[PDB]
Structure 1
């Protein structure tokens, strides 16, 4: 089974490009990272920064996680990210996504490595 750390990388890391290229970025990346296999994963976020910069966030601002746990960290700086959201018509196995490029602060939950 892949570990939680590996699934985090698969589902969210895209250090190969600095930002979403085109409106077809979500469509391609959701399929590519295998997120449209059994089902259409409804929402996903890709971070366009080095893995090192993303792992470093675990030593940045401590904040509460949405579930109330206390192991969440907020990046000090804004990061290049791409939000992928399933359109209303999209139907498995024809998964359609809207792509939104933005520069934001990410909040990650951290665990031992």
Structure 2
């Protein structure tokens, strides 16, 4: 499936099985634009997080309960949700994915 394929390709499951990972299907510029949108607090308490005004297309990749390195197995769940990312640097761009509502 898409998750097992993209996780491997992006060097995410080549040397380990990462429990979860979300892929955003919007242009990179549109995602970077979120850093100037709705300012909220990151679950960790920090406040350099921003929620997207609109929902975006995303694919949630979750490891099955059976997955074990080297045979990682993922469950693919497509959806449209508001993304929340932590921004920093100059330019101000996303460095962490916080959640999706």
Which category of TM-score, normalised to the shorter sequence, fits these structures? Answer: 0.7 to 0.9
Indicate the RMSD between aligned Cα atoms, in angstroms: 0.6
Deviations 1:75-105 (A, max 9, x none): 0000000000000111100110000000000
SS in 1 for 2:79: strand
Counting matched residue pairs gives 90
Matched, 1:38 2:53: no
**Where in structure 1 are there 5+ consecutive unaligned residues?**
1-23
Looking at structure 1, the residues matched to 47 and 65 of structure 2 have their Cα atoms a distance apart, in angstroms, of 34
**Where in structure 2 are there 5+ consecutive unaligned residues?**
91-101
Kindly indicate which of the two structures has a greater share of residues assigned to strand: 2
Give the ranges of 4+ consecutive aligned residues of structure 1 lying more than 3 Å apart after TM superposition: none
Looking at structure 2, the residues matched to 62 and 69 of structure 1 have their Cα atoms a distance apart, in angstroms, of 11
Kindly indicate which of the two structures has a greater share of residues assigned to helix: 1
Looking at structure 2, the residues matched to 102 and 47 of structure 1 have their Cα atoms a distance apart, in angstroms, of 10
Deviations 1:6-49 (A, max 9, x none): xxxxxxxxxxxxxxxxxx01010000001112210000000000
Tell me the TM-score normalized by structure 1: 0.78
